[PDB]
């Protein structure tokens, strides 16, 4: 089979995480819960092989509607370095993951981050976020919306103003766009 000329080899970029067993099931004040978050966000969630698009963030512990899930943390950049880092990541053939906090700064997830990069998009979400104050340094905290069971790939809405790139996720009642 080596004399065969199989050329599935290099049509995408360098990265992978696939072929994992992505089937687990078929189915207080603020800073104390922030401590709870930093404790239990490792054991709560998991990144595995999605059927939607590549990979996704699953869920294992049965979450009640309202608790914290994970903090979407990474490097910290300002508004200037966006186009420069985008040109570099496009030059190396790397997808660019960023998330704006507010009118001040943006948290990167490309070179340094956590296991929270890997949430796909839908238009019927079950997650959102707000702005808190852990001693001046504000943060990006994943709340919940409804009782999420085990095995579900997690989703949230991106609050996009409707303004190119098509809908390569496929939700149910989606507007066929991210914006």
């Amino acid at each position: 089979a080596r004399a065969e000329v199989h050329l599935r080899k290099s049509a995408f970029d360098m990265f992978n995480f696939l072929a994992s067993k992505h089937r687990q099931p078929p189915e207080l004040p603020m800073p104390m819960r922030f401590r709870h978050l930093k404790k239990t966000s490792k054991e709560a969630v998991g990144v595995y092989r999605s059927p939607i698009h590549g990979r996704g963030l699953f869920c294992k512990r049965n979450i009640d509607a309202g608790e914290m899930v994970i903090e979407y943390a990474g490097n910290v950049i300002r508004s200037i370095q966006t186009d420069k880092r985008e040109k570099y990541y496009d030059s190396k053939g790397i997808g660019c993951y960023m998330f704006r906090i507010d009118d001040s700064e943006v948290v990167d997830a490309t070179m340094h981050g956590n296991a929270a990069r890997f949430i796909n998009h839908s238009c019927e979400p079950n997650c959102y976020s707000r702005v808190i104050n852990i001693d001046g340094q504000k943060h990006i905290v994943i709340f919940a919306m409804r009782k999420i069971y085990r095995g579900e790939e997690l989703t949230y809405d991106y609050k996009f103003p409707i303004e190119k790139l098509p809908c390569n996720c496929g939700a149910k009642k989606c507007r066929k766009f991210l914006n």
């Binding site: 207080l28 004040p29 800073p31 104390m32 401590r35």
Partner: protein
């Protein structure tokens, strides 16, 4: 005539061992008292005190206060699992309870 190495520092602890040995001779608990029991017991009492004061300090910072008032002690015991089982039938004064509302006493919305 030698160095008065007290049995606290000779052991490497913080709780006194002389007071513990006095309160084991003078409690009528047995006739004769060994010389490993007050050391071992001072260590156990120290570790439990450290165990509760760690969580007390964490909650005291996390509600943005300097000192520790007993509401933090109530939260620090009753949030933990094993210390709540130890302090089973105990009421801390000025304690209060955990904030807990049942699942059916709050409304929900269906239409639109």
């Amino acid at each position: 005539r030698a160095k008065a190495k007290t049995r606290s520092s000779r052991a490497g602890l913080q709780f006194p061992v002389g007071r513990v040995h006095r309160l084991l001779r003078k409690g009528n608990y047995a006739e004769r008292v060994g010389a490993g029991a007050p050391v071992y017991l001072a260590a156990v009492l120290e570790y439990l005190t450290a165990e509760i004061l760690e969580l007390a300090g964490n909650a005291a910072r996390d509600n943005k206060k300097t000192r520790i008032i007993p509401r933090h002690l109530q939260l620090a015991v009753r949030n933990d699992e094993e210390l709540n089982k130890l302090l089973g039938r105990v009421t801390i004064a000025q304690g209060g309870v955990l904030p807990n509302i049942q699942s059916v006493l709050l409304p929900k919305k269906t239409e639109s």
